[PDB]
Here is the input.
Amino acid sequence: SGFRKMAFPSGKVEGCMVQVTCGTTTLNGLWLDDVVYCPRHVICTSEDMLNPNYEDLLIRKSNHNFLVQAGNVQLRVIGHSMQNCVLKLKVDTANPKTPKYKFVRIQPGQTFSVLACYNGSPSGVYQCAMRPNFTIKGSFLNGSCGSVGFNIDYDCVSFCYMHHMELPTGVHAGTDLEGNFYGPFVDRQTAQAAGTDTTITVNVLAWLYAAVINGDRWFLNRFTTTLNDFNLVAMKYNYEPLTQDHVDILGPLSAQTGIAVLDMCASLKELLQNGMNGRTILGSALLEDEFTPFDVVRQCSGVT
Amino acid sequence: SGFRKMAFPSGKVEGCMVQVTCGTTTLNGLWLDDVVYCPRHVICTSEDMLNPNYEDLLIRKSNHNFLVQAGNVQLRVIGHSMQNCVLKLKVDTANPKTPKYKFVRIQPGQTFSVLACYNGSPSGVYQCAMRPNFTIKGSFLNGSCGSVGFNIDYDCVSFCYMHHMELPTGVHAGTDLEGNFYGPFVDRQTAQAAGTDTTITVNVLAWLYAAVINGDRWFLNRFTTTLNDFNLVAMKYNYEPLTQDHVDILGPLSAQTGIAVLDMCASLKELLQNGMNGRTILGSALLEDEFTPFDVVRQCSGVT
Ligand SMILES: O=C(Cc1cccc(Cl)c1)Nc1cncc2ccncc12
Ligand SMILES: O=C(Cc1cccc(Cl)c1)Nc1cncc2ccncc12
Here is the structure.
C-alpha cells in the first residue's frame, strides 16, 4: 500500500545527458546515437534574446563553435542543423549508453518524469504533468535548459519533453524532441500568456480510485450522477469536461474497486461542492490531478 | 523557480539491484563489490514467518540455495552470513557498476530517495522521510522487499535504508544497511505498534523558506515569537520541539530570505492556530514536512 508521486527510474536518461557550450552560453543536451539534441537558444546572448533571428544567428556558427562534453570527455561535432526550436549536432561517436527510445508528443493531461540537469550533470528526478494550458509546473533554475521529460515502457524510453523557458509566472514552457513547443510559446524574452489552467478531471478520478485502493474511503457517498450533470459541476469549478473516452480509460480502476465511474464522479462532485472539511486523501488536502489512470494502475500493480 | 518533491537520480542504484531467490521466496538484493545484501526473511516460508528462528532456518541453507540473478545473468554464491536482519551473500564477481558508496544510519526527520524494485528490476523512484516514529510512508507492494533508500553526495551514494516490512496500518518499516531496524520493529508476522508520529518542525520551517523563495509569501506576518512560546504551540499540535540546533541549520535559509528564524516560527504558529483558510503554499493545502533545510538549499541552488 501507499501512494507516492513516483517517477520512472532515471538511469537510462542519465547516460544520455551531455553539456553543450556555444559562445558564452552553456545548457544541457541529449545524446542519442550520433546526434546531440539541445534547445536552439544555446547560440544566443542575452542581448539578442529580445528578438532573435535564429536562422541568421546560426549562419555565424560552425561545427567547431559547439562544444559538447560527455562527463569529462569531449565529442567531435561533424554536423549541425536546426529543426524547429532545437539544434541537432551530429557527433562522430554513437553514445554507447543510448537506450531503446522513441520521440513522442504527449497530450495535455498526460504525465512524465523530468531529469533536471545542470552542466550536463543530473541533480534530481520528479514526476509532473503537461497542463491543459501546455505549461509544466516544474522546478528549474538557470542552466536547466535542455533537461528532458520522458516515460518508460519496459526497456524503451519515450522522450516527450525538452525544457526551454520559464515564464514570468514561474511556470515552465518547452518542446517535444522535434523542436515544437507545446502551446503558443515562442523562444523569446517577451512576456507570454500562459492561459487558463483547468484541473485534469480524469486524473483526479483515477487518484480517487487509488485512494479507495489504499484504504482512504471517507469520501465515498450514497449518490450517483450522469455525465451531463457532473460536467455542469466540472464547468463551474474549472475542471476539464469528462467524456466517454475518459470513462473508458477508468474501466480497469472501476473494475478493480467495484465503484462505477459515474458513482465516483458523484463523490468528486460532492468533494467539489463541499470541500474536504479539514480531512485528507492520500496525505493531500486538495484534489490531485497529476496521476493518470495508467499511473495509478502501474503504481498499484508494480510494472518494471 | 518551482518546488518539487524531487528525488536523487537513481542510475547509480539501478546498476546495483539484483534478484535473490531462496526456496519459493524472491525479493530484491543490493550488489556492491562482491557482496549482495538482502533482507534475511528471504529464507522464510509464510508458515515460519509467524515466529521464525532465523539462526535455525539459515542452518538448513547452503550457498547453492541462494539464487542471485543480475539482470539476466546468474552470480555464483561463494559465502553467506547473517548480520542482524540482513543476509550478506559473497559472490565470485565484483559488480562492475558498483558506485562510490557508504552505509549510513540516518536520524528521524532526515529524508531519502527510494528506488522501488520488483524481481531485481526498478519500477520507480520517490522522495520520502524517516518519520519521528521510525516508519516511512512509502509506496510498496509484495516483492518490494530489498528496495533501498539512499542519498547522493556528488559521486558517492550513501545507502541508508533497506525495505523489509509493511505494518497493518499500511506504513513501512525497514533497516539500515547493517541490518538494524529503524525503530522497535522486528521481522515477524505480528501486529506491531508504530507509535505517535509527530510533524518534523525544522522541515516545515525549511519548506516555508522555500515558499518565500519561490514567490508564495501570503503567510508572512507582522509577528515574532520566542523558542519557548513557539514550542508550547508545537506541543499542542504534535510538532517536534524546536531547539537551537534546528535554528542553526535554518541559518542559510534565514540569510537567503532575510526573515529571522523566530519570525518564521511566528508565521508557522499562526498557520497552526488559524489554518490555511482554503489557500495553498507551493501547491499544497497542508504544511509539508518532508523537505529538510539541506533539501531546500540544494533544490533552490542546483547541486549535481
Ligand atoms: O528562461 C530561461 C531562458 C530563456 C529565456 C527566454 C526564452 C527562452 Cl527559450 C529561454 N530559462 C530558464 C529555465 N528554467 C528556469 C529558469 C530560472 C531562471 N532563469 C532562467 C530559467
Ligand atoms: O510485509 C511484508 C513481508 C513481511 C512480513 C512480515 C515480516 C517481514 Cl520482515 C516481512 N512485505 C511487504 C513489503 N512492502 C509492502 C507489502 C505489500 C503487500 N504485501 C507485503 C508487503
About this structure: The longest strand of chain A covers residues 156-166. Chain A touches chain B through 53 residues (CB under 8 Å). Helices of chain A lie at 11-14, 54-59, 201-213, 227-236, 244-249, 251-257, 261-274, 293-299.
